[model samples]
Target: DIPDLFINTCGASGFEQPQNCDHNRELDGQTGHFLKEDGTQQWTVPVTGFYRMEICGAGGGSNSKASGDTGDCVTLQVHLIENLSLRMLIGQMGESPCFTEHDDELRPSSCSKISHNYVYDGKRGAAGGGATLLTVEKDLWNVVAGGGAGASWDGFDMEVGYGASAIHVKPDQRCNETCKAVSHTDFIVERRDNRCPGEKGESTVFGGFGGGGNSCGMLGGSGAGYQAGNPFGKSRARSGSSNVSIDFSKSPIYYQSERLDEGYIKIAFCRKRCEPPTVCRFRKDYFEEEYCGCPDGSNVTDTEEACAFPLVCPSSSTNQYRNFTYEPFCLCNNGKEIYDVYNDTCE
Candidate 1:
């Protein structure tokens, strides 16, 4: 089955305003197509089945020194029950330092502005691209792809930061230099002597400053990591990281490349499959019993009633034969007294 949300911008011209791309358009719940906004949006699953999702982060902005890095791409399969709500955050591209005037109206709040004497000359460092994220209930992250770092130019030379790399199967492996941090951990890339560090890129969980130019030169901002992005430094802005909840052995597909502008996401239904039991199967004896045509242990009449009876009675009690075939009822003191349900006592 094709994705319910098919958002393909591959090989297309980059938009001047990433936010305005597909602005005010309604998301197609059937096809799973979406708009290019930089915030949280909700998608309702139309059917209960396996779904394939493809996500890509936004590209970093370019400058005279170096062009911004592209966002990473990731593909995986997920089983979403029918009518479940899926939340998404599409990434925004980093701001370009090519403007001639102070066009605060055109700049997105997520991007950083140039901070040097040549503000009017458009010699400013670009901001890092924003991250794209997917989550379920209670803010649990399901998938994440980091954006690219923006380009920066010192008066003499310019440098571009790398895009986020794929996450290693080993959590301890380093993603890049300037940061030894791992995914899902908190880290900060601070400024040092005679250097202007770019601001850290942001996710729903973390935030950082944008890239800017100074006497030292321009510095690109970092991209988002699995949790957060590495801020820009004199060396180079860090690229965004990636993560998925599924196992790597499940044949999850991944791609990292230079995107021209904003990030994208597409989700399509895959196939139908059996779902796990919702009720707890506390009783081992009834393991072979089926409830209401469901498989054994797939359904339960009541948790309290089903789990209350013991297979073997205590020393003071004896297993009683009852007319009901669902569960065994224990009799205390050879049926002389009623058994205490709570304490297994005879009275």
Candidate 2:
């Protein structure tokens, strides 16, 4: 039987408000599905069977000049046994750079320190979105989708560069006025290597963030890769890649043309068909009960009288013959001599 399951984000930073976090609703007629939380969450499989899964990562935040990039989407079929606790990490959307005191409306509640950076330090670049990861037993990853990169604003040339889509190749050098982000491609090989987290953007901000862009005024963060995107100079950030487990029946179908505001996952069960039993022959016993075979001893037709008369004893005195009594006895040639049936000999 199929179960109604929806595992949403719980107890994450900036998602304290009910309206801002843990939203559960039907999208395109599918009910009770989606995850937008920013931390680790757990879910258990209800039944043992095949399940179809659809997953998408979170989008990056925008800058004053350019908009943020979108996360990647992966769809595939998998067989999950019952009671398997699945660990899911939904990516958080990127934070937009704050320019004015009135810019509160433009920022999402998920931001850690929305107004502090822009109010004190003037205009700043946006932060990159977080990555979404699905793991199973022993902390082994089953699926991973890298988050989008934050947009950047170049103060030197007064130019704005938008974030790139999810890509496979890693960026070696920082972006300049002419340099741009790479396009998306297949990540089959990279996913097998187990290298999927996006790189942090180049900035003066402390404690480099995961799947997040730098808060510097120049460059934005790059999307996820084998190694995160490298910084060159003041340039736009790159998008993160997507990968699936090798255990899946087939390769996943990717969606990269557009950006998704938050992370999400959908699951549906696959039902199996039933078959009929085989036919066999039947028989009847003395009690008139229908069965598959004859009763014990019914096949025995030979009797003790049918045995040869004046039967010579076998070399072994203990030897005996089979009869209707289900015991051993013998008819020996003992006209004058007494015969011992118990020992099957003539005395």
Candidate 3:
């Protein structure tokens, strides 16, 4: 009371502890703690005047060797009167398959405030974060963040020693000097063999790709980091605090759409043929040899027709010959074996 009456600035010029003094200044903007993962949390005003709030979405979960998607992070500053209540909802981490009464494939978390007008989407442990929204009133709300994309599972089977060369290898065919054949064991091998769903995503920091297993599915990436999944058990790491640090003056908060995938499909087994174009197998699991011509192209030929091509050899009068990729080529007229690389035909 004995200080400068006309110019008593708070924290800038004269007195300190402005919030505690008679001239309690405006509330400073700061981040809050993270919401709980299990359920809804409440944030009650302490001595609220005009306060700033920052909110963040949870990270995605994982499946196979793939990674999970991530959530959005945002902040909003609003002018408050007093005695208002704010509820917070933390996102759940993604889940993997389990053998119970439930059909748990991979479960994504869903987080939101009042109305889910703007909600982040979740995935199959290979998906995104929940929607993040900050509510001021029923009609007044801010869509803070969007969710990440869903993860793909690996479907391709890795090659094993002396395994099937192609899905349509002939049953009588054996591993020989000219060609290696597919074993009977591999004939029935389905795309799902050794196939895992997808790996979980990361927390806090930006996301990274999951392990590109033998499968042909699209992998997922994590978004923000703050909570990562556990390896051998069912627990996650939580930072608890929002650890808010940002400037509203900056343009655009973190709000992005999820990624789309073309979905899972088995890759057909293909192998080189003596005949030019090569041999292609059925895309699905077919236990027996079912070879087909190459798709429309110049370097194509019918396998059976090419296999029946007449084998020409050098006459007794000539002994000179050359080797082609398939059978050997010879020149009986010259009496000197001339390799027929240019034209694999006996002359």
> How well does each candidate superpose onto the true structure, as a TM-score?
0.49, 0.51, 0.29
The CA root-mean-square deviation of candidate 1, after full C-alpha superposition on the true structure, stands at: 13.9
In candidate 3, what are the lDDT values of residues 39-97, reduced to their tens digit?
22333344322222334443443554554444444433322333454443333222222
RMSD of 2: 23.3
Among these predicted structures, which one has the highest TM-score?
A: 2
Best by lDDT: 1
lDDT of 1 by residue, 258-303 (tens): 4455677877544333334332112223122212211222233555
**What is the model-wide C-alpha lDDT for candidate 1?**
0.46
RMSD of each: 13.9, 23.3, 30.9
The Cα local distance difference test for each model comes to 0.46, 0.43, 0.26
Candidate 3: RMSD over Cα atoms? 30.9
Query: Model 2, 5-60: lDDT tens per residue?
Result: 54433333111211243443324432223333434555666665446566766666
Clashing pairs in 2: 128-213, 174-231, 174-232, 198-224, 199-228, 223-238, 223-239, 224-240
Q: How well does candidate 2 score on lDDT at residue 202? A: 22
Cα miss at 253, model 1 (Å)?
A: 3.4
Clashes within 3 Å, all models in order? 15, 8, 32
